[PDB]
Task: structure prediction
Amino acid sequence: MIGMDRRSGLPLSGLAHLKQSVEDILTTPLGSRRMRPEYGSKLRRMVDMPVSEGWKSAVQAEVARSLGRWEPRIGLSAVRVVAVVDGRVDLLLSGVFEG
Amino acid sequence: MIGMDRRSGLPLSGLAHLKQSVEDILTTPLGSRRMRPEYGSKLRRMVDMPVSEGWKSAVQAEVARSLGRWEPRIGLSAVRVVAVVDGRVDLLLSGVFEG
Amino acid sequence: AYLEQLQAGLRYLGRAGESGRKSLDKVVAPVNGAISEIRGAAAELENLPGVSPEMAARLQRAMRGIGQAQGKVNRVVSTYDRASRALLGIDERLDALKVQVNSAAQAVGKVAGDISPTLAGVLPSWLLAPSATPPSEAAASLPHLLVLQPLTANAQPFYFNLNTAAFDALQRNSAYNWSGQVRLGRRPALQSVGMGEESILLKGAVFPLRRQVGNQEKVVGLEQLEALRRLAERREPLILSSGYGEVQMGLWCLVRISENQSALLGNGAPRKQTFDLEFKRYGDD
Amino acid sequence: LLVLQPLTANAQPFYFNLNTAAFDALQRNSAYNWSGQVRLGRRPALQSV
Amino acid sequence: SGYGEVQMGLWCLVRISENQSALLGNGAPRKQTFDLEFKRYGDD
Amino acid sequence: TTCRTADGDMLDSLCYHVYGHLLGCVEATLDANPGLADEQQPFRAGLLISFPDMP
Amino acid sequence: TTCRTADGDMLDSLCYHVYGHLLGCVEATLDANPGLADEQQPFRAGLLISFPDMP
Result:
């Protein structure tokens, strides 16, 4: 499938379109889209919550829901905390490719 | 639903009508209404009985019946004795709102 | 002369719709005594400057009553046969009540208009709006064992951990639909005619007096298995979200809940709730 | 412990306690009617009926 | 009930089966192990 | 079923919270509302929508 | 099935205690009773109602 890039307008198809397809899921909140209320992630609700070991398993369980809806060509493997600086947690979104 | 108040005749709708809907259930005895014999509560039969721990569970089981008939927009939570003065027991009728 | 006219006009229609129970002939004379007599006010009220703040609420008290008088006549008349009504000939007469009283109601509305339909049931944009913030279960200090979450995508998910349900067994039946066709002289041929039912069964036990982890001044509740019931009467599939192998399990509709709550308290409160949930894989595209 | 009470609303209710019956077990089965329709080349469709 | 939700629905009674044993002389038991069985009456 | 907005409440979100779906549910709201579509779609804080039944 | 009242027994209560329901059960009692409805509805202590069968 051939789509266009979000910035700079260039049509990119293979796997750069795959990565921006995921980051339109993860950063859109629910109900922000027009006439598509069941689109996006609850990750903005997980913004600025304390990083516990139940916060990690609630992000894995919510990325898997939101990518399971509107990204069928990605099989999610794991989400892991790899570093912590002040506020900035960072997550290695790893997943196999299907489709 | 918009009804009128019992005293002063004023039409009150949202939640003041909800509270007077409950107190028409609790203070009417059974058979006192005209052509509606299965309306009201047996709480007048519970008037001037000794406050045991089985009297409490018989009031919870009878408020839940009488509100279950003619008040579907109220889910009853609990009925608790909170004070005792001479004769005057007083009951915190707590319940969630539905409908 | 409308102060004499309409109040006498409703008096005829009180005889019209009530002296017509088991007869027909007693209806026509008060109806003839009204149509040519409500016209005596529909022509009188053609030119009034809005004479009083009173004296026209009286017209509203009357035209509501004459509006009730059409409903009494036209229902008592409608209980009869049409052939018995056609021989009387008041099918072409009761429509003149729809002409004269409507011309009288338009005449009252020109002199004294109606009150505006005031609004008392105006709510804010909250009472039908879900709290999109995640609950205290999702922020707990326990890794979630399994997660139920529906298709509406804004409803509150159910989190399996030691605070809520905490199953320790996981049956996963998965058939494969191979149909046998018996051939006479040889082995029966097997054909793959589908996929068959794949099911997941969650055993376990909820003890609703063990306090939540770290002694959070809060116990495991009695509500905390009925939340599985409320989430199951949505008639809606659920995404299972584990955390070990594949994380994106499919759509799994919930089929059966059966608790065995025993060791009761005085008010019926158990202190064990051994349940077994039972799912089937919703076959989406 | 539990109270039985009928629809006539004047009949005498039954009270579960240690004086009358006093159950100590409570099975609560609750099915949900999902009907399977077998499709030929794929998983069977489930409908909430 | 008196613990979680108090307003349970309409529940019709379907089966009573007692097992009365350890009898007295006139047939009177001194244990009666029963099992009641309800089904939820589906009102509006 | 008249509802009052805030300064950021929006139409397709509101009638999704009220009805539960959006197939035939926005233009039925815009039908029985005088001058609603003329107002800017990020709504102001004090405009009233009467949501009709059967969208 | 003739019954005798007290000074506070009332008609719709009595034929609910006798019959078990009130759909078509009060006016059938008032039909086969001469001068019952003329008497005041909070009854006196000594008036007799013959409740008919099949209300």
Remarks:
- The helical segments of chain C are 2-16, 25-42, 57-76, 82-88, 91-94, 97-111, 226-230.
- Chain C touches chain B through four residues (CB under 8 Å).
